[PDB]
Amino acid sequence: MKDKIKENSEKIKVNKTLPYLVSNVIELLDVKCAVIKTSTRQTYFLPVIGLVDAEKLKP
Amino acid sequence: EFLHAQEEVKRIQSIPLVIGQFLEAVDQNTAIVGSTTGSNYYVRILSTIDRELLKPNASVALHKHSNALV
Amino acid sequence: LNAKVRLLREELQLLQEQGSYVGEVVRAMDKKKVLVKVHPEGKFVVDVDKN
Amino acid sequence: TRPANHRQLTFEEIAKSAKITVNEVELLVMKALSVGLVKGSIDEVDKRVHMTWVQPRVLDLQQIKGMKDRLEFWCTDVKSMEMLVEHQAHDILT
Amino acid sequence: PAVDTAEQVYISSLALLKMLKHGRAGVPMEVMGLMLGEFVDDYTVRVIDVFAMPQSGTGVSVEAVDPVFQAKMLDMLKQTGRPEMVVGWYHSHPGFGCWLSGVDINTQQSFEALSERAVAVVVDPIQSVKGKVVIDAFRLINANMMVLGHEPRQTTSNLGHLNKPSIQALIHGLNRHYYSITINYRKNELEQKMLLNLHKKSWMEGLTLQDYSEHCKHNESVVKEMLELAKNYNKAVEEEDKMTPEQLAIKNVGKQDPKRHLEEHVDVLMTSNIVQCLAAMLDTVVFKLI
Amino acid sequence: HNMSVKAMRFPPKSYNKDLESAEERREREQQDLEFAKEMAE
Amino acid sequence: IPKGYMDLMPFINKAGCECLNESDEHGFDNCLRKDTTFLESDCDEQLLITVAFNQPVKLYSMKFQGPDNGQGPKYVKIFINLPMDFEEAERSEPTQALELTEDDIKEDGIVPLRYVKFQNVNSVTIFVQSNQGEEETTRISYFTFIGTPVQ
Amino acid sequence: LTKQYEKSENDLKALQSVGQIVGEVLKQLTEEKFIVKATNGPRYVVGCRRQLDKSKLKPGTRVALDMTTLTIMRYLPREVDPLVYNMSHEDPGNV
Amino acid sequence: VLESTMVCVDNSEYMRNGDFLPTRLQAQQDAVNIVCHSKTRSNPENNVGLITLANDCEVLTTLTPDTGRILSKLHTVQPKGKITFCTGIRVAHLALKHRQGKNHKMRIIAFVGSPVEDNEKDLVKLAKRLKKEKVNVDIINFGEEEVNTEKLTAFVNTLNGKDGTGSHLVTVPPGPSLADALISSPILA
Amino acid sequence: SLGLGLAAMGTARQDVYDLLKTNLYQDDAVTGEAAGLALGLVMLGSKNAQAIEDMVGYAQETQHEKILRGLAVGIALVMYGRMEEADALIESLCRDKDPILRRSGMYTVAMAYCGSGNNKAIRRLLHVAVSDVNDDVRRAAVESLGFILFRTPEQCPSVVSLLSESYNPHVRYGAAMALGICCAGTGNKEAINLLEPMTNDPVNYVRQGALIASALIMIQQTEITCPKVNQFRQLYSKVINDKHDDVMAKFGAILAQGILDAGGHNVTISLQ
Amino acid sequence: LAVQKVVVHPLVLLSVVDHFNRIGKVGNQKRVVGVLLGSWQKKVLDVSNSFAVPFDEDDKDDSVWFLDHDYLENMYGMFKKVNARERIVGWYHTGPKLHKNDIAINELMKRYCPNSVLVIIDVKPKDLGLPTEAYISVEEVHDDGTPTSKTFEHVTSEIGAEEAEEVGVEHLLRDIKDTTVGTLSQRITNQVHGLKGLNSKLLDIRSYLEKVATGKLPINHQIIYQLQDVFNLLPDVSLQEFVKAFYLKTNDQMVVVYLASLIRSVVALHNLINNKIANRDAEKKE
Ligand SMILES: [Zn+2]
Secondary structure, eight states: OHHHHHHHHHHHHHHTOSOOOOEEEEEEEOOOEEEEEETTSOEEEESSOOSSOGGGOOO | OHHHHHHHHGGGGOSOEEEEEEEEOOSSSEEEEEETTSOEEEEEBOTTSOGGGOOTTEEEEEETTTOOBO | OHHHHHHHHHHHHHHTSOOEEOEEEEEEETTTEEEEEETTTEEEEEEOOOO | OOOGGGOEEEHHHHHHHTTOOGGGHHHHHHHHHHHTSEEEEEETTTTEEEEEEEOOOOOOHHHHHHHHHHHHHHHHHHHHHHHHHHHHTTTTOO | OOEETTOEEEEEHHHHHHHHHHHHHTTTSOOEEEEEEEEEETTEEEEEEEEEOOOOSSOSSOOOOOHHHHHHHHHHHGGGTOOOEEEEEEEEOSSSOSOOOHHHHHHHHHHHHHOTTOEEEEEEEEEEETTEEEEEEEEEOOHHHHHTTOOSEEOOSSGGGSSOOOHHHHHTTBTTTEEEEEEEEEOOHHHHHHHTTTTOOOHHHHHOOOOHHHHHHHHHHHHHHHHHHHHHHHHHHHHHHTOOTTHHHHTTSSSOOHHHHHHHHHHHHHHHHHHHHHHHHHHHHHTOOO | OHHHHHTOOOOOOOTTOSSOOHHHHHHHHHHHHHHHHHHOO | OOTTOEEOGGGBOSTTOOEESOOTTSOHHHHHSSSSOOOOOSSOSOEEEEEEEEEEEEEEEEEOOOOTTTTSEEEEEEEESOOOOSSTTTSSOOSSOBOOOHHHHSSSOOEEOOTTTOSSEEEEEEEEEEESSOOSSOOOOOOEEEEEEOO | OHHHHHHHHHHHHHHTOOOEEEEEEEEEOSSSOEEEEETTSOEEEEOBOTTSOSSSOOTTOEEEEOSSSOOEEEEEOOOOOHHHHHHHTOOOOOO | OOEEEEEEEOOSGGGGOOSSSSOHHHHHHHHHHHHHHHHHHHOTTOEEEEEEOSSSOOEEEEEESOSHHHHHHHHTOOOOSOOOHHHHHHHHHHHHHTOSOTTSEEEEEEEOOSOOOSOHHHHHHHHHHHHHTTOOEEEEOOSSHHHHTTHHHHHHHHHHOTTOOSSOOOOOOSSSOSGGGTSSSTTOO | OHHHHHHTTTOOOHHHHHHHHHHHTTOOHHHHHHHHHHHHHHTTTTOOHHHHHHHHHHHTTOOOHHHHHHHHHHHHHHTTTOGGGGHHHHHHHHTOSSHHHHHHHHHHHHHHTSSSOOHHHHHHHHHHHHSOSOHHHHHHHHHHHHHHHTTSGGGHHHHSTTGGGOSOHHHHHHHHHHHHHHTTTTOOHHHHHHHHHHTTOSSHHHHHHHHHHHHHHTTTOOTTTOTTHHHHHHHHHHHHTOTTSOHHHHHHHHHHHHHHTGGGTTOOOOOO | OOOSEEEEOHHHHHHHHHHHHHHTTTTOOOOOEEEEEEEEETTEEEEEEEEEOOEEEOSSOSSOEEEOHHHHHHHHHHHHHHOTTOEEEEEEEOOSSOOTTHHHHHHHHHTTOTTOEEEEEOOSOOSSSOSEEEEEEEEEOOSSSOOOEEEEEEEOEEEOOOHHHHHHHHHHTTTTOOOOSOHHHHHHHHHHHHHHHHHHHHHHHHHHHHHHHTTSSOOOSSHHHHHHHHHHHOOOTTOHHHHHHHHHHHHHHHHHHHHHHHHHHHHHHHHHHHHHHHHHHHHHHO
């Protein structure tokens, strides 16, 4: 499973490539899910938070 | 074939459609519409559209790509 | 009837052509150039169709 | 027994056939109508009962043959106009 | 050996409806499935039947093919007289045309590794209207062959260039990373007559008489509607006498046309009354007590 | 109505000339080619 | 074998080629063999062969040989890729009904097949409706299908 | 660690997910057509998922739309503003 | 060998008897457990299924490469009604014709625990149909073999024929357990 | 198979037919198209039952479309110049559920009624052209009109003129080809005047058919005989040298150039 | 009853035909049985998908029949994963008519759906009727004293389609379907079909009465009871009250047709005027 973990982390580095779009977390819903407002003045709903623990995020 | 041509043209009305505002009819088949994106466009009107409904300040659905009155 | 059928099939392709902007003419220029104001997008210097 | 064209029974026939006085005919039809044995209405001024429906009963083989004979006439009438509408409206028939 | 543009993908009537039903139910998810059939020759790919794959989870994209689900369904379909191999896969594109994205190209490479002539069929259940389904069949272009200066497939006929490629597909890599295979439909007499039963009313309805109270009320209302329309129709005649030819259509925009509604009211009433009269006259002899 | 419809005469105008012109229809194809050759790249 | 078409007997699954109404003393294994041993039946001369191929295979011709004593076939109905109960053969549509004549059933006669209908044959069943001399039982020889794999 | 693999694998499934445009339902036109308005954006005539209740999509309901098709995924509760959230969760100081 | 089998369990009224310890129904539950396991170990691709022989034959489980579900179904099998041997074999024959793998060989296990109430002609014609279709049915003649020894003899002899060795007519006299006679029986051999 | 049938046209040789039928019966897509066409060439005008029964019977059994395409052309040649003796076959082919066999009936009408001007045959081709389910059969129905009207060339630019502007591009292509087939080598001004707008048709293959048809009409023709030959000669060059034109529009232009100056300006096309 | 109407979608008909054409191949030509999938909306069934199940029966004996119910469960779970909202609503079989053993099969299917609906889907293209005949099992309580038995009660069946389903169907019927015929022509064709349907059904009753008359079939006394009701409902169109009302109604509709025809002629003359003005104006400038 170690090769699977390392190969998995490689796929993250491609998607975690810069630039990132700076955004502000608006909400944290349950049905675990987040609502963010991008710097392009766009409100989005994220069915999954992403690569950051939902406990470490606040509005 | 005319009925088939009429029926197959309706795919121009497939969702999603951006909502505009009918401002002025330039001629029979073209009009000036104000998209909710904030831009005024001179576009074409679908021939299968009841022009009796194109009242001033009427909400119209525009093609998401071509802004045409569909 | 045939032209009416033909116009209908070509209409589907013609409706997919992108619509035209609406602008206000500031002043005509030389070499068939015009200074226009696109409604949300400010001013442009544009060419004029041959017709 | 009577055909649907002549289902207007007088009070005299009900009185005579049922061995009851004419004045008791009306109450007899009420029981029949209330229970549901027969359907219709009573015309007291003309001393007549307008009968519109009877409880279906058991038929012999012979009466079933007669019932089928009515179907043969009924089938011909339906077929006759089926060919009539087809012939008359042939141009516009899809 | 080079593929030919004369190659055709034949989709049965059953296979077409299942992809449309599954694709529409799965809007907007790119719901995928397997196309069963038989590679008849180097120029035909028959799609006899398809079966839909489950969605592993949320996400508007094509998920990986589940081998156990594929193996179990193929094994069970063989038990009911369906011993047809998988000739490709189908997935839905709900409204943005028929093409292959980056994910779909990788998904197709999985099938092309197993079967070199596997076909990726894309169905647009949203843009498909009656009498015209937005469908397309794609197979990948090997980048090694095309970069060196070779056409992806040889052209020996006109059959491969009858359908003009769409700009939406040409934008998303058509004729660069994948090519389109012309799609024909296998329809037999039995399946056509069976589908003709759709919207076929019962024989009771033909002889059924509309309620006379509502028929008179409908006749009452519409005739009253023409009373105002006729009054407006007179005004339209005088107005159009003194109207410039540029206003024959512009001035009719947004204002109701008395002539147009008069014809519709006339057409509705004459269809309504003639049918009611004719059906009533037929019933007087058909349902006759004598 | 049938007599009036049968009396409606169409002048022998050059049909299929109100369709897309050959030169104008050629304009779209070249412009659309650059749309595919630039936006996709 | 005809040029360009091989003998497909090695291609078939020997373990998986079943027979119906076969006398135990001479069976399917002796049938495929080139030697003298045959495939006789027990219940009646009527008999149903089932042959399942390893890979998709086209059948160009067959050599369904029988002894000239009269027990050889005179009516062969061939069925392709059935999804067969000795009553279906009575009333069904054979792929190519074949009246194997005395020339066809001898040691040298080959029987041509409709190559159009024999293209994708994963499993084939051959039925012997009637023999030549109206005997109680039938007898077979090295019944082999001549053709090429689908590939 | 087995748990480490699960967290990394859950990460991979998370990466495939795509954000959804937040809007508001304005009026249900047909049984399959809706008018929605983006939070800061135009109004569209959009569709809806078959699995959705479609009775909770009353006018004014906040919804999440696909980025491509703009179809309604789900109805969301009334949005609490981040500033309003900080108003409610503001420590007085145990006075 | 690669063969598909169906067990023709008996759930008639006579299965309530204690002639086979403790109950003929309980005796056959152990017996089915042994034959179902025996076929599994012969080849892992072996298919087994369960059919009842009640007043109306009921297919409790079709062919499946599982053993627990066969004993799971036999647990709820309660004695009711009368044996119908005529229709049981045919219904079991029908399930065999619709096996998962056509390469498998026909096989039926019959647990006759009640007399077969038909003329010998019906049993004879039934065997020929199985023999034509290469269907082998191993019948265990426990219970009322004093009256069933002749009807079933016409079955196996017509089915097996001369030098058959395809269907056996093992008749176990009443004793401690009929399953104990199965491991020495040619059915599991 | 193509070489044998081309070298055995109308010979009615049993050995050639037997060998070719062996290749056709192999049910191979590539060789089936070849054998089917060659079968008609060898049995050209023979109208024998056996060739018809074997070929049409094969078409209703083969599952390969290429074999059907070759047979469709082949079946027509079997009954070439057979006048009304092909009525029984034509009605059998035209009523067929197979689109290609329906196309064979159109070709059979063309060959059985070549140059006869039979209005009954023209009535049938026009019916299929305007009312049919398959565009290929419609395109072949209009194409077959040229074979019936070449003996009277002035008549095609009147029956086909209206089909030249139809909504169906396949009928438009057929109208172009019908003018080319009927007016081949005649330099018909009326036919060329119909094809000149076709060369700018929105559909690419319609343009190709007009370009090829234009070459067939005025092969060998000079400026005096036809004033428009110089216009089309430059049009062929312009299409070929147009990097932005469709590839099959150029295919017609290139073939038009070869036909226009075929045989070193010493050959002509004339079905009569 | 528990089922008011069964709506069978065109996918099921195509699937059932394909089931019959792939099992009823060179093997045999019996009836094939599958499992119906659909949803429930108020009291109208919505049969929308189906899958085939292995099935066989004896031609002679009706009590001998096999249905792979384990196959039923395995594919249902296979189908439930793709579309959870589509549950088992019954079974189908392509038999041209009912069979004696369907009541036994429905009992097997009743375990997976208590209100199981059997839909007989005739693969043969019948000319006048729908191919679907939807039946539900009911417990008929006889009044003669005969013990209560399980019987099939007819449920009115209709062929309806989904939005995308109808899109594909119109694509497959694009060429064959003739939509040029106006509404009025279609309605009259419905009346002709209504006359044909009634004649066929009247012929079926007459054929049944013929068999009863000659003793081929026993006297039912429930059909005959119903038949008296049919003949009693036969209206008398010779009554003075009815004829006057019919004339009163017919004349009421005629004046509306006369008014609409009168308006049509005026509008037609207006069109002719515009055409002649346009024609005259075009030639004046040219
Ligand atoms: Zn995709």
